[PDB]
Design an enzyme around this catalytic site. Structure first.
Site, PDB file in Angstrom:
ATOM      1  N   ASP A 136       0.887  -1.158   0.000  1.00  0.00           N
ATOM      2  CA  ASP A 136       0.000   0.000   0.000  1.00  0.00           C
ATOM      3  C   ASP A 136       0.932   1.217   0.000  1.00  0.00           C
ATOM      4  O   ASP A 136       1.667   1.428   0.960  1.00  0.00           O
ATOM      5  CB  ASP A 136      -0.896  -0.029   1.235  1.00  0.00           C
ATOM      6  CG  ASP A 136      -1.836   1.161   1.300  1.00  0.00           C
ATOM      7  OD1 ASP A 136      -1.514   2.234   0.779  1.00  0.00           O
ATOM      8  OD2 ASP A 136      -2.930   1.063   1.911  1.00  0.00           O
TER       9      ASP A 136
ATOM     10  N   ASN B  20      -1.573   9.347  -5.014  1.00  0.00           N
ATOM     11  CA  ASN B  20      -1.042   9.799  -6.295  1.00  0.00           C
ATOM     12  C   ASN B  20       0.240  10.600  -6.243  1.00  0.00           C
ATOM     13  O   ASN B  20       0.959  10.595  -7.256  1.00  0.00           O
ATOM     14  CB  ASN B  20      -2.159  10.634  -6.980  1.00  0.00           C
ATOM     15  CG  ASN B  20      -3.431   9.871  -7.229  1.00  0.00           C
ATOM     16  OD1 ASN B  20      -3.617   8.711  -6.855  1.00  0.00           O
ATOM     17  ND2 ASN B  20      -4.400  10.522  -7.889  1.00  0.00           N
TER      18      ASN B  20
ATOM     19  N   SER C  10      -0.210  11.493 -16.115  1.00  0.00           N
ATOM     20  CA  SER C  10      -1.521  11.604 -16.751  1.00  0.00           C
ATOM     21  C   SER C  10      -1.527  12.832 -17.628  1.00  0.00           C
ATOM     22  O   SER C  10      -0.897  13.850 -17.254  1.00  0.00           O
ATOM     23  CB  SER C  10      -2.618  11.766 -15.668  1.00  0.00           C
ATOM     24  OG  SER C  10      -3.881  12.125 -16.238  1.00  0.00           O
TER      25      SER C  10
ATOM     26  N   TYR D 159      -7.500  15.448  -8.093  1.00  0.00           N
ATOM     27  CA  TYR D 159      -6.771  14.471  -8.890  1.00  0.00           C
ATOM     28  C   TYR D 159      -5.822  15.128  -9.894  1.00  0.00           C
ATOM     29  O   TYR D 159      -4.634  14.791  -9.992  1.00  0.00           O
ATOM     30  CB  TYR D 159      -7.819  13.668  -9.692  1.00  0.00           C
ATOM     31  CG  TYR D 159      -7.176  12.630 -10.608  1.00  0.00           C
ATOM     32  CD1 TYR D 159      -6.801  11.391 -10.110  1.00  0.00           C
ATOM     33  CD2 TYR D 159      -6.996  12.913 -11.953  1.00  0.00           C
ATOM     34  CE1 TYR D 159      -6.231  10.441 -10.956  1.00  0.00           C
ATOM     35  CE2 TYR D 159      -6.416  11.975 -12.801  1.00  0.00           C
ATOM     36  CZ  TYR D 159      -6.032  10.751 -12.286  1.00  0.00           C
ATOM     37  OH  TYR D 159      -5.481   9.805 -13.136  1.00  0.00           O
TER      38      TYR D 159
ATOM     39  N   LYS E 226      -1.590  14.940 -10.409  1.00  0.00           N
ATOM     40  CA  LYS E 226      -0.887  14.546 -11.622  1.00  0.00           C
ATOM     41  C   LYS E 226       0.012  15.661 -12.105  1.00  0.00           C
ATOM     42  O   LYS E 226       1.101  15.371 -12.615  1.00  0.00           O
ATOM     43  CB  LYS E 226      -1.866  14.039 -12.701  1.00  0.00           C
ATOM     44  CG  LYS E 226      -2.514  12.717 -12.262  1.00  0.00           C
ATOM     45  CD  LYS E 226      -1.485  11.592 -12.058  1.00  0.00           C
ATOM     46  CE  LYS E 226      -2.270  10.280 -11.905  1.00  0.00           C
ATOM     47  NZ  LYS E 226      -1.278   9.138 -11.853  1.00  0.00           N
TER      48      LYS E 226
HETATM   49  N1  LIG Z   1      -7.464   5.229 -17.094  1.00  0.00           N
HETATM   50  C1  LIG Z   1      -7.090   6.451 -17.460  1.00  0.00           C
HETATM   51  O1  LIG Z   1      -7.764   7.146 -18.225  1.00  0.00           O
HETATM   52  C2  LIG Z   1      -5.768   7.022 -16.869  1.00  0.00           C
HETATM   53  C3  LIG Z   1      -5.043   6.480 -15.839  1.00  0.00           C
HETATM   54  N2  LIG Z   1      -3.930   7.155 -15.413  1.00  0.00           N
HETATM   55  C4  LIG Z   1      -3.152   6.570 -14.318  1.00  0.00           C
HETATM   56  O2  LIG Z   1      -2.804   5.227 -14.620  1.00  0.00           O
HETATM   57  C5  LIG Z   1      -2.571   4.497 -13.374  1.00  0.00           C
HETATM   58  C6  LIG Z   1      -3.430   3.242 -13.388  1.00  0.00           C
HETATM   59  O3  LIG Z   1      -4.774   3.661 -13.641  1.00  0.00           O
HETATM   60  P1  LIG Z   1      -5.849   2.582 -14.195  1.00  0.00           P
HETATM   61  O4  LIG Z   1      -5.143   1.318 -14.439  1.00  0.00           O
HETATM   62  O5  LIG Z   1      -6.709   3.233 -15.182  1.00  0.00           O
HETATM   63  O6  LIG Z   1      -6.762   2.435 -12.898  1.00  0.00           O
HETATM   64  P2  LIG Z   1      -7.095   1.248 -11.910  1.00  0.00           P
HETATM   65  O7  LIG Z   1      -8.029   1.701 -10.871  1.00  0.00           O
HETATM   66  O8  LIG Z   1      -7.511   0.004 -12.645  1.00  0.00           O
HETATM   67  O9  LIG Z   1      -5.661   0.884 -11.312  1.00  0.00           O
HETATM   68  C7  LIG Z   1      -5.105   1.706 -10.213  1.00  0.00           C
HETATM   69  C8  LIG Z   1      -3.857   0.941  -9.771  1.00  0.00           C
HETATM   70  O10 LIG Z   1      -3.307   1.634  -8.605  1.00  0.00           O
HETATM   71  C9  LIG Z   1      -3.223   0.742  -7.537  1.00  0.00           C
HETATM   72  N3  LIG Z   1      -3.389   1.474  -6.268  1.00  0.00           N
HETATM   73  C10 LIG Z   1      -4.366   2.332  -5.872  1.00  0.00           C
HETATM   74  N4  LIG Z   1      -4.210   2.736  -4.610  1.00  0.00           N
HETATM   75  C11 LIG Z   1      -3.072   2.094  -4.184  1.00  0.00           C
HETATM   76  C12 LIG Z   1      -2.394   2.080  -2.953  1.00  0.00           C
HETATM   77  N5  LIG Z   1      -2.754   2.804  -1.880  1.00  0.00           N
HETATM   78  N6  LIG Z   1      -1.294   1.306  -2.850  1.00  0.00           N
HETATM   79  C13 LIG Z   1      -0.900   0.556  -3.931  1.00  0.00           C
HETATM   80  N7  LIG Z   1      -1.480   0.508  -5.096  1.00  0.00           N
HETATM   81  C14 LIG Z   1      -2.568   1.280  -5.178  1.00  0.00           C
HETATM   82  C15 LIG Z   1      -4.447  -0.180  -7.789  1.00  0.00           C
HETATM   83  O11 LIG Z   1      -4.477  -1.290  -6.918  1.00  0.00           O
HETATM   84  C16 LIG Z   1      -4.192  -0.490  -9.275  1.00  0.00           C
HETATM   85  O12 LIG Z   1      -3.010  -1.274  -9.450  1.00  0.00           O
HETATM   86  C17 LIG Z   1      -2.915   5.501 -12.257  1.00  0.00           C
HETATM   87  O13 LIG Z   1      -1.748   6.171 -11.805  1.00  0.00           O
HETATM   88  C18 LIG Z   1      -3.886   6.445 -12.981  1.00  0.00           C
HETATM   89  O14 LIG Z   1      -3.918   7.696 -12.268  1.00  0.00           O
HETATM   90  C19 LIG Z   1      -3.333   8.163 -16.185  1.00  0.00           C
HETATM   91  C20 LIG Z   1      -4.141   8.717 -17.145  1.00  0.00           C
HETATM   92  C21 LIG Z   1      -5.290   8.098 -17.667  1.00  0.00           C
END
Ligand SMILES: NC(=O)C1=CN([C@@H]2O[C@H](COP(=O)(O)OP(=O)(O)OC[C@H]3O[C@@H](n4cnc5c(N)ncnc54)[C@H](O)[C@@H]3O)[C@@H](O)[C@H]2O)C=CC1
Ligand SMILES: NC(=O)C1=CN([C@@H]2O[C@H](COP(=O)(O)OP(=O)(O)OC[C@H]3O[C@@H](n4cnc5c(N)ncnc54)[C@H](O)[C@@H]3O)[C@@H](O)[C@H]2O)C=CC1
Lengths: 255, 255
Positions: A64, A108, A139, A152, A156
């Site tokens: 975490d 983040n 992002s 958010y 970023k």
């Molecule tokens: N989906 C989109 O449109 C975009 C996503 N992002 C970034 O991409 C990354 C992944 O996003 P997605 O895969 O879309 O979302 P998602 O919700 O599927 O994945 C988020 C990831 O972060 C991990 N996470 C969250 N809180 C955590 C914590 N306290 N400790 C450890 N791990 C933690 C989750 O378990 C997962 O692996 C993030 O940094 C998100 O901000 C960037 C731009 C666009």
């Protein structure tokens, strides 16, 4: 030339929408180790990842990013005892929920900073370490916000700026860094989410009515960016392409 | 046309180097009330401020911006019971110390966001409130970092991005916003300070070899920017002048 062949990679948040696809894409190459750190505990995803490439050892550790830095150090100690060296750290943790102000910032920005700061103790060339590569998931909102999720987007913006500074510190620390900044990517992150003070209750619907890219295409370009290994890059991964931002020169410290 | 005459202003961090000079500059105008919130306790400064302009009522409240939002809500409830209305909120708290990662983020970004969020409960037009104006103190480091204090610079990138988003939300909330982003200003903040992981132990000495401006000149331009009252402005207060910044449009959500 840089290659992922026989490299040891730590991927924080390697099981999420973009993460899991990026992990699968990485395993097309013959890494030595892929260590996945995540708060998601999904044994079936780990089984899938172990099955892609028999030449790579895939290890999972629950993690975490909001824990105090001493706890991150403790876990890195365990991982460096297991691997001896770590070549690339991908910090990908992120939440999208402007109802959670403290946690959005802790996950983040603060967590990303702390994992980076903690791994610098093992890698800093001033301490006799071997240097390293840091790939941070920013992002496009760090360039220009989704104003309906102001908290958010500000986190970023902080990740983009911080990473650009890490890259400028490479000569001192021996650690290079760059951001991979996805455009809107179809994952559960954006399927349903909370705007700040509910300024836009239909933010997810409205956002998904515009062009997006699948997580598979984002993952393909994410690993292509890693392979290009360009310190200081501000990569934009939007609409299935790989591009890079020329950051505007508004001010300069002179130092 | 906007005027500060007969207005009620809350100034978080109104006794620091830039703060106190800006407080003095604001008191050249016939405000109704100037309410200073700060963790500095300097009764001589409060007496000095009260004596500048007899038409203005100056009230001081001790306040640490790192408290949970419910605490800020309690303080604001008291100020609104005291004065009934508040027209402008200035969020100016900041620390410069990259050895204090958690505190740098908690003061520079989280605290600012929380004070803003708390006052929206009183001002948001969707809550039946009258709207209002938020002036946030950013920094030129939010445009382009001082890379030797990467954690601090990232926090300021977040403030600039967050404030821009508040301005785009004005039509919904009734609360307009802008940042004032000073260049290097001669206060105790920059005489001696810590770089991240001591990457540059002489960061203050090196930075001070390059141009700086007095805090009085910064304060003059800060009040000029408030009087211009331009929603969404990104003000640069550097080398004794006031200039707007045009932010590059690298990406657009479409919404
Ligand atoms: N989906 C989109 O449109 C975009 C996503 N992002 C970034 O991409 C990354 C992944 O996003 P997605 O895969 O879309 O979302 P998602 O919700 O599927 O994945 C988020 C990831 O972060 C991990 N996470 C969250 N809180 C955590 C914590 N306290 N400790 C450890 N791990 C933690 C989750 O378990 C997962 O692996 C993030 O940094 C998100 O901000 C960037 C731009 C666009
Ligand atoms: N001096 C410079 O070169 C620059 C300063 N800044 C920003 O200007 C603002 C004022 O800084 P300076 O006057 O130069 O430094 P300063 O150290 O004299 O003033 C800092 C101000 O923030 C307040 N503050 C700090 N922690 C606080 C907390 N937890 N709760 C409430 N108030 C708290 C202080 O008590 C003081 O009022 C800060 O936001 C700083 O980041 C921006 C760019 C340039």
């Amino acid at each position: 030339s840089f290659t992922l062949t026989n490299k040891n990679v730590i991927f924080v948040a390697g099981l999420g929408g973009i993460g899991l696809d990026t992990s699968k894409e990485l395993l097309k190459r013959d890494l030595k180790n892929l260590v996945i750190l995540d708060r998601i505990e999904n044994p079936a995803a780990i089984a899938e990842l172990k099955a892609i490439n028999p030449k790579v050892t895939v290890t999972f550790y629950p993690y975490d990013v909001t824990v105090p830095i001493a706890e991150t150090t403790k876990l890195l100690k365990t991982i460096f005892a297991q691997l001896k060296t770590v070549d690339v750290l991908i910090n990908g943790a992120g939440i999208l929920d402007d109802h959670q102000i403290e946690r959005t910032i802790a996950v983040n920005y603060t967590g990303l900073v702390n994992t980076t700061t903690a791994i610098l103790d093992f890698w800093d060339k001033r301490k006799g370490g071997p240097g390293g590569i840091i790939c941070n998931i920013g992002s496009v909102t760090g360039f220009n916000a989704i104003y309906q999720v102001p908290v958010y987007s500000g986190t970023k913006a902080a990740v983009v700026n911080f990473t650009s500074s890490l890259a400028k510190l490479a000569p001192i620390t021996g650690v290079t860094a760059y951001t991979v900044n996805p455009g809107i990517t179809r994952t559960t992150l954006v399927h349903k989410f909370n705007s700040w003070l509910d300024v836009e209750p239909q933010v997810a619907e409205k956002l998904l009515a515009h062009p997006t890219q699948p997580s598979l295409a984002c993952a393909e370009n994410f690993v292509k960016a890693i392979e290009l290994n360009q310190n200081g890059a501000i990569w934009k991964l939007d609409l299935g392409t790989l591009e890079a931002i020329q950051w505007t020169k508004h001010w300069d410290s002179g130092i």
